[PDB]
Amino acid sequence: TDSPVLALAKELISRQSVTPADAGCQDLMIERLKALGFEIESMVFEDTTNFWARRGTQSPLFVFAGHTDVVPAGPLSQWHTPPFEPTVIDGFLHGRGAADMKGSLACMIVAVERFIAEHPDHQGSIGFLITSDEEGPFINGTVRVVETLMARNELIDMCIVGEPSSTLAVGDVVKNGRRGGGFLTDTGELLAAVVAAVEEVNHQAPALLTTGGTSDGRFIAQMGAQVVELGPVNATIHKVNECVRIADLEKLTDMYQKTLNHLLG
């Protein structure tokens, strides 16, 4: 019986969320978060769907951010497997969005489930900031949501963007935002927690980048949050035969869980 991580990642991969359509991926995530006691606000901007969820009312507010949309498959004759049919071959999960970034999304949900099972009375607060337009021409959701939050004085302290950051092995490389773009005091709390988690799992510190990363993560950073990008191997993103090592999804989930333990446990 599939691990919960593999099961959810397969669910998500079967929904044809070619941008900006969502095929119910956020609804799947929202269902799981409702069970955990998150409040949910779905926000529509242009014809894209987004949501914010939050459990807890105390500082620090830690957020998982990502997107449910994927690029189109491209020419079928080049695929060995159906792009929107999650296919398991010799320990890899093939399908559009397996690496960018439905596998990460599944890991975030299972991590928070596991963390909450162990720490129902955690410190701080956990949030999810999920968009469906990151892979499209018109990348609006994150900016609009962040603005909504900022306007009600709901400031995100720390955020993991689960974009596929890694080269050969999950967690070999992380990307670190400049808080306030380099202009606000930065404790390093998040980076030290994600690094601790990556070392607990891999027994090796990740390599670090301080540049690059998505425009949405950079916006979350500019506005005030410590941000780290950590996710699976990125070799096959936006290529045919996109896939992800399943054991790496299991690891990544543990890394996410250990970060929550460090920050909120």
Author numbering: 2 to 266
Original paper wording:
DapE hydrolyzes N-succinyl-L,L-diaminopimelic acid to L,L-diaminopimelic acid and succinate, is part of a biosynthetic pathway that is the major source of lysine in bacteria, and is essential for cell growth and proliferation. All the DapE enzymes characterized to date belong to the M20 family of dinuclear Zn(II)-dependent metalloproteases. In order to examine the role of the catalytic domain of DapE enzymes and the role of the active site loops, we have engineered the HiDapE and the DapE from Vibrio cholerae (VcDapE) by deleting their dimerization domains. Removal of the dimerization domain in DapE enzymes renders the enzyme inactive, even though the resulting truncated proteins have structures of the catalytic domain that are remarkably similar to WT-DapE and AAP.
The monomeric state of VcDapET was confirmed by SEC (the estimated MW of 28.7 kDa) and DLS measurements (the estimated average MW of 23.2 kDa). Two VcDapET structures were determined, the apo- and the dinuclear Zn(II)-loaded form. The final models for both apo- and Zn(II)-loaded VcDapET included two molecules of the catalytic domain in the asymmetric unit. The two V. cholerae structures are virtually identical and superimpose with the average rmsd of 0.25 Å for 265 equivalent Cα atoms suggesting that binding of Zn(II) does not induce any major structural changes. Since the structures of VcDapET were determined in both the apo- and dinuclear Zn(II)-loaded forms, it is evident that removal of either the dimerization domain or the metal cations does not alter the overall structure of the catalytic domain. Similarly to HiDapET, the most flexible regions of the protein are Region I and Region II. Region I corresponds to the engineered loop (the connector) where the deleted dimerization domain is replaced with two glycines. Region II (residues 210–224) forms a loop overhanging the active site metal ions, which includes residues 211–213 that form part of loop V (vide infra). A change is observed in loop V, which in VcDapET adopts a conformation that is significantly different from the one observed for WT-HiDapE (in HiDapET this loop is disordered). Interestingly, this loop is also partially disordered in the structure of HiDapET, while in VcDapET structures its conformational flexibility is signified by the double conformation of the main chain Gly 213 (peptide flip).
